[PDB]
Design a protein around this ligand. Structure first.
Ligand code: PLC
Ligand code: PLC
Ligand code: PLC
Ligand code: PLC
Ligand code: PLC
Ligand code: PLC
Ligand code: PLC
Ligand code: PLC
Ligand code: LMT
Ligand code: LMT
Ligand code: LMT
Ligand code: LMT
Ligand code: CL
Ligand code: CL
Ligand code: CL
Ligand code: CL
Ligand code: CL
Ligand code: CL
Ligand code: CL
Ligand code: NA
Ligand code: NA
Ligand code: NA
Ligand code: NA
Ligand code: NA
Ligand code: NA
Lengths: 311, 311, 311, 311, 311
């Protein structure tokens, strides 16, 4: 078949909607998420008009091969969607109602700056390319945009699923292209990061600071070096959950900063021992007593500064 | 073809059944399981009625393209099911008997609160969408619901496979949708968690408590810090088997609590050494002797409280 | 087409065979294995009989769509097999000879009780469902059962590939079902477990026992705790190669038992130090000297008991 | 169909273009990247020429099976591309305009010599094989070569996407083959390697050098051995992100060199202790004081030499 | 269609060739490699002979469904190859020239005895099964066997790609089967194993031997136990890259042997301490001084013996 012809010189308007049935597998490293959803399409084809009184039916059903259907695609998908047509309904004035159920793997960039206390705006870009015979333009039918109440994205809270109603119409390779932006707003469930990463990392750091109440060099070296190794393990664990970024993340900044605290603690432990061996313990004692206050204080202030810069 | 027309104005009833052939790959992190099963369908199509005496046959066989078949889907699947039609049988009054064998990857949420002593209710949601010409509604044929005796789900015990007989009828995108809930009740085989995670974690903790029978600071620091690192390793091992949850799991709560015991043990070991160096060993000895009882007692009471809150 | 009609009221016999071309990817955790094989089928269809003298040919060739073929399936496969038809030959009396080459992923439970010195019986279950017009029953053509000499399953020795010649005929959803059991007997190549897991695990344990020839508490704590951590690493390594079982495996039992030896060694090291500090070294020396014999002796006896219970 | 015949002796020119829609999953170990793109093709088929006045349309649309289409393939892809035809447009003189959207996994070798400060030239090779009746040759339509502004390759900066306009025409198996080279120039975002690998590795190394301000052998052995183990962990982490190369990478060279510094530091710590026990501390003190300067100086010079040899 | 009939009792010869376009993903653990290649086939079908003068064409082109094509398969593939037909050419005497491009995952056993200084012979087995009407036999057209100059197999050097010209003809299920052996000779790039595994493993071993220049038991235990743990880490790293073998590999033998050196070093360190505590240091000093020479000497001799047995 070929596209419906214009009454005059108007573009063909294709009304769209996406209804989310499942959202799963938000992969942070790949910056992808999987979706299973209804895609609804609506347009006018006057060649399909009929008389209700005469035909004795308010609606006709067609198979996809029998009529013209716009080639709708997703911009930001790995591979073309897996689609199954559910229904095609034609009303007497030639208004087509198309419904498919599809699944796809979507590429959408994530901003990790405030990880694990981050929020994201996932995008699903709908697109249509114009044909020689006619310009095709997309619109949003808001009554056919939504999500099922049970849609859960493990490790995330789903805030809203809306569409930017005005398309981005632009030229690509001498044809018009009409693009819509469907936006899925989500926020990370930071809860588990507290007992599993943040608090264990703070406990080992505070354990290293017990060295400031000890004159045993051998024990101090064991305290600071062992805890540092445990800190390295947490640093490695965290970076396996995340892609490499051309910026610092909030957690990355704290993790990095804690290395400086371990480094300065080793210097203090070394300086303390060196003075004692040199028969200057009163001086070592001044440095050690100051360290007992300076370490937790500088750690608290540095964290207030970091929280301020990031939030 | 198109749907069978009503004798009057009754909905079309599609009777369903699921017979489980295989259940495998319950993935805790993804909250998925794979299934291989029979789907049986039954409905009345009077246009297919025939005379047995005349035709000389009690049953007719058809191919799926020759007749009308309801578009049955699963709600909570990653991709549409892989289905192969096994048989279509039509009796003289036009009763169709449909049988397919399918495989699918099912999304079903898991409650990890009592992990690894948890039970789950897996769901398989069957669905059909109504057409303009007719409301289509699902029912359960209980004689065609079951599972093969050999179905094993590795790491789990299978309790029951039943269906909620009344469908959930509701409107979605201006059509009626009829949804059935097939429920697979399972309970986790907690056995291996005992020798592999729980007991080793208790042994290292009890080893750290030997420090309460030692005056050697250097040895004490080695005992408590080394065992803490081993505890971190078990914490990391456990969290790799589990998704991130917006709540505490029973194992997660014990693991987290044990960190506090390691932390207080380091404080005690530090306080003991500090007093001895200050020439107050009699006092250090009072704190150490009290710790020998306080640590195991507070550990037992805290575990009784946790078990009570979770079970 | 439809099934060949009975001369009287006999079931249709479908003769089967499986010839293994490749066996690969025995996955212990998933309890699966991949197979690539010939499936041979044979049955009588009298409607296809012809005269050899008249037709001037001993055999006719058909394409699968031209004739009736039984719907043969595998019970214990993840997804339906990937099949390609190789040949269909019809002899003058209407005997059909069918040959396909297929690949499949097979689910088959493994018994890990004697791991890594275990043997297994893998199963491939062939099945056919009877039709309304005729009962279909399976049989084994032993001349068409075997395996190629080069079939290798990495990490395993292949003993035999046989079929249980009598089918399991039973009712499932009001039709007869005919099931055959093809059995692939294999035994694990335990060799590499010796230099890679078993001996290293014994070496570190024996290294911990050097503490029974040392009065240095600090050194003893370092010896027993460090080796225990290495033992934890081997425990974790082993459990990553295995699924979770509702029973103890032989290796699992030894690994678990070794923890008790580490635990008692820490107690001995603690008791030794405590007595020396209390000015009772003669007594500490009695416990230490007894431990030098008791530890290796109790370890040898406990291993004889375990080997007896498992083998 | 078969290829359009020559007016007189000339090869058939197929004009090509690639417009990149998505670039993702640059896998360093596999030396692959995934691409989603438009492929545009243009050629003259005079057998498809038509009269606009007669046919009643100015352009004709066809399906791929209705006309002759050149067999265009990619050289360096794992499997044949997943392609969906978007449009086939024929103008009155028989000029065909072909447009498909495809996705593919591309093999392209990477040079890791300057990792993680490396740049790469990824290739997509387009190819066509000549037929008996006609030589087919490829060209670039520069107006149809480009990339969307949002194309992001996580962990990389995209510099340019251009084509080498002259094809490589050559004989393979007695036929002409026409090959085009599309080049995607990228540079690695080295940023995250600094806080995550490089600085932590320098901190632990500098911590080992505190041993040059200590006379405690026991503490020195703990300092140098513990930090060496942490260095091994970083070496292992880095090599998991990279393939095995028959040459040294810049990071690999620094990592390897640091082992020599740990080795010499152990020798120094051993020599120091040996002299002190032999009652030669004045001499040990000379070696230790020299080491305080020699270690950081030789480390700085060796790094200047390495940076010079690699950049 | 059906096979070309014999002039007189001679088998049909199918000439073959394989031209390698890409070799990738040699997976050591799975013993697989991926290939992308041309498969060329040639045979005589006299029923397709034509007169060039009469027909006015020197060559005819066909589609695969229009003529008889031999069912060529690969023996040692996971799944059937992904093939696309490029060209079918028929010359006037009825000589068919067939060309396809395919991709496949190939199973080929690897000999790890001399890992990582090993060479391998990968096999691609081509096969054809005879039909009732005709015996079919394979041959090699050497002019159509080759590889593109750019074919690279990451981590390997490609030496040669040749075919064993004489087929292996044998009976399987009462038909003749004709099998060709295409051989891809490769040698491992051992380079990176030196700086990444071999040298680090030697450095830690030599570090443990510093204990022979120390009288400090506590420091000695730290030196030998810490390095042993690092050795365990390298053993685990190496075994993750390799399948389990029923024989010792060269690297495996060195790794295993090094454990014995660590074990004897612990005995020496224990014996040294025991004698010193017993007031027999002169004797301890004799054992320690002998160990300084014995350890490196026995290590050198044992490595010469191992290299001799393996190479
Ligand atoms: C990149 C960061 C560099 C870190 C440098 C930190 C030095 C701080 C000086 C402390 C002042 C003090 O109080 O002690 C300084 C003492 C010297 O003491 P003295 O002069 O002999 O005693 C006083 C005698 N009267 C009576 C004459 C006054 O030296 C030390 O303790 C040595 C320990 C520092 C070693 C850290 C090494 C890290 C290696 C990294 C190389 C890249
Ligand atoms: C986050 C939780 C913080 C933990 C604090 C624990 C308090 C324990 C008080 C001990 C009571 C006691 O028995 O002794 C108090 C002693 C001081 O002894 P004295 O009073 O000087 O002697 C009396 C002399 N006459 C009788 C002759 C006059 O202090 C200590 O041993 C210091 C060791 C504890 C340090 C723990 C460091 C933790 C770092 C983490 C920072 C975020
Ligand atoms: C879950 C299992 C727990 C295992 C307990 C092992 C008991 C061994 C007793 C040895 C008998 C002996 O000979 O010495 C017992 C000695 C006391 O010696 P005394 O009696 O004071 O001296 C005699 C003086 N006269 C003769 C002059 C009168 O105390 C110890 O050495 C204590 C060290 C062991 C502590 C282990 C703590 C583990 C914490 C884990 C908590 C769950
Ligand atoms: C400490 C850990 C010690 C490990 C002991 C192995 C147990 C065993 O003896 O394993 C048994 C296996 C095979 O057993 P089977 O063939 O099933 O016997 C069936 C008997 N029925 C049917 C009567 C019940 O023999 C072996 O290959 C011996 C290799 C062991 C080498 C260990 C080197 C150290
Ligand atoms: C593969 C690299 C091997 C490295 C060899 C390093 C040589 C050290 C020379 C320093 C100069 C010095 O001053 O000390 C050298 C001293 C001997 O001194 P002395 O003769 O007793 O002193 C003078 C006394 N008079 C004046 C009375 C005569 O021995 C040591 O400290 C021993 C420690 C080094 C052991 C390292 C073991 C490495 C094992 C690895 C096996 C492959
Ligand atoms: C361990 C020692 C630390 C590693 C030193 C990195 C060497 C390097 O920085 O290399 C240089 C590259 C740039 O090189 P290019 O873009 O190829 O220019 C080649 C043009 N020439 C040939 C004219 C020079 O990195 C950078 O832009 C700067 C980031 C370095 C920060 C490291 C912090 C510590
Ligand atoms: C699996 C392999 C087992 C390894 C055993 C090797 C023993 C070497 C003997 C050295 C000869 C020597 O010179 O010293 C022998 C000394 C005893 O000396 P003495 O007679 O009391 O002294 C002389 C006194 N006069 C002169 C006054 C008479 O014993 C030791 O130091 C003991 C330390 C070795 C313990 C190793 C434990 C490993 C546990 C594994 C158990 C399965
Ligand atoms: C202890 C440390 C072990 C060192 C490993 C020895 C390697 C080897 O000996 O391997 C030898 C292989 C070549 O083997 P081939 O060509 O198959 O011999 C077949 C011909 N015949 C019949 C004569 C045997 O190549 C190499 O140049 C090895 C370079 C090794 C550098 C390691 C530095 C440390
Ligand atoms: C101890 C050393 C660690 C130092 C690391 C410091 C990294 C630099 C911090 C830059 C701030 C990044 O955080 C982001 O900034 C932009 C604009 O700046 C804001 O955007 C909303 C937000 O505040 C935040 O999402
Ligand atoms: C040491 C500090 C760690 C502290 C963490 C404490 C977390 C508090 C536990 C909340 C209990 C969650 O566990 C859940 O409770 C609800 C009712 O409330 C019940 O609900 C389902 O039946 C069950 O009992 C249990 O599945
Ligand atoms: C020190 C603590 C660890 C102790 C754990 C002990 C676990 C108990 C082992 C019971 C034996 C199980 O192992 C199985 O036994 C039965 C007979 O009983 C036999 O049955 C299979 O044939 C086999 O011999 C063995 O596969
Ligand atoms: C600490 C021991 C480590 C020793 C390893 C030393 C490696 C030697 C460096 C070889 C140069 C590699 O680096 C590469 O060389 C080529 C050509 O030489 C140069 O070009 O039209 C580049 O600068 C660089 O891409
Ligand atoms: Cl799409
Ligand atoms: Cl479905
Ligand atoms: Cl099947
Ligand atoms: Cl392609
Ligand atoms: Cl194949
Ligand atoms: Cl034979
Ligand atoms: Cl034959
Ligand atoms: Na259409
Ligand atoms: Na220590
Ligand atoms: Na139908
Ligand atoms: Na058929
Ligand atoms: Na075509
Ligand atoms: Na054919």
């Amino acid at each position: 078949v070929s596209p419906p012809p214009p009454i005059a010189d108007e573009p063909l308007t294709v009304n769209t909607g996406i209804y989310l049935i499942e959202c799963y597998s938000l992969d942070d490293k790949a910056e992808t998420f999987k979706v299973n959803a209804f895609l609804s399409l609506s347009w006018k084809d006057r060649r399909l008009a009929f008389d209700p009184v005469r035909s004795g039916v308010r609606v006709k059903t067609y198979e996809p091969e029998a009529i013209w259907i716009p080639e709708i695609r997703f911009v930001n998908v790995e591979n073309a969607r897996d689609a199954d047509v559910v229904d095609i309904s034609v009303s007497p004035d030639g208004t087509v109602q198309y419904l498919e159920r599809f699944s796809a793997r979507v590429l959408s960039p994530l901003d990790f700056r405030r990880y694990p206390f981050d929020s994201q705006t996932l995008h699903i870009y709908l697109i249509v390319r114009s044909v020689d015979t006619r310009n095709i333009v997309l619109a949003v039918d808001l009554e056919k945009v939504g999500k099922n109440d049970d849609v859960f994205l493990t490790g995330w809270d789903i805030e809203s699923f809306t569409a930017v109603v005005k398309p981005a119409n632009f030229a690509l390779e001498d044809r018009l292209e009409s693009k819509l932006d469907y936006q899925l707003r989500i926020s990370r469930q930071y809860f588990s990061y507290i007992p599993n990463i943040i608090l264990p990392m703070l406990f080992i750091l505070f354990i290293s600071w017990t060295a400031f109440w000890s004159t045993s060099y051998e024990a101090n070296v064991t305290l600071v070096v062992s805890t540092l190794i445990a800190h390295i393990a947490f640093n490695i664990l965290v970076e396996t959950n995340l892609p490499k970024t051309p910026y610092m993340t909030y957690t990355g900044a704290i993790i990095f900063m804690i290395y400086l605290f371990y480094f300065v603690a080793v210097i203090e432990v070394t300086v303390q021992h060196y003075l004692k061996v040199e028969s200057q313990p009163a001086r070592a004692a001044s440095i050690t007593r100051a360290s007992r206050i300076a370490f937790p204080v500088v750690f608290l202030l540095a964290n207030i500064i970091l929280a301020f810069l990031f939030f």
